[PDB]
């Protein structure tokens, strides 16, 4: 007789979209990226792998002013149903008069190994 121990799937590490406007403030720190990690019932995990990624990690903080502020991520996209892992989950953000922004985006692609016959 087969046996499972729950199952669990790491989604990756996504980008960290904080929301604002241009006409408030602009971003002086922040934090780059986050993990999220899902486990749960083997079934759900195969649902979801049906579909393609478009799983984003977000907050609104267009009322947040000057100096340093932490906040918690919020989550979206995929079915919190399961047990929603996240590294650091509480983010720094320092939104300050707008000074000069760049942007420090890492896409990353991944690729998906299984067939067991590589050579």
Same mark, same amino acid.
């Given at each position: 007789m087969p046996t499972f121990d729950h199952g669990?799937?790491?989604?990756?590490?996504?980008?960290?979209?904080?929301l604002y406007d241009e006409e408030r403030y602009?971003?002086?720190?922040?934090?780059?990226?986050?993990q999220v990690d899902l486990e749960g019932p083997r079934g759900v995990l195969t649902v979801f792998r049906?579909?393609?990624p478009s799983?984003?990690?977000?907050?609104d903080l267009t009322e947040?002013? %000057?100096?340093?502020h932490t906040v918690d991520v919020e989550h979206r996209g995929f079915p919190g149903?399961?047990? *929603? #892992? +996240? %590294?650091?989950?509480?983010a720094r953000?320092?939104?300050?008069?707008?000074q000069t922004?760049?942007?420090? *985006? #890492? +896409? %990353?692609?991944?690729?998906?190994?299984?067939?067991h016959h590589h050579h």
């Open positions: 669990n799937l790491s989604l990756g590490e996504l980008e960290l979209t904080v602009d971003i002086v720190e922040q934090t780059e990226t986050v049906f579909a393609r799983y984003e990690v977000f907050v947040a002013g %000057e100096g340093s149903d399961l047990a *929603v #892992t +996240v %590294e650091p989950r509480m953000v320092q939104l300050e008069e707008r922004v760049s942007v420090p *985006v #890492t +896409v %990353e692609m991944i690729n998906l190994e299984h067939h």
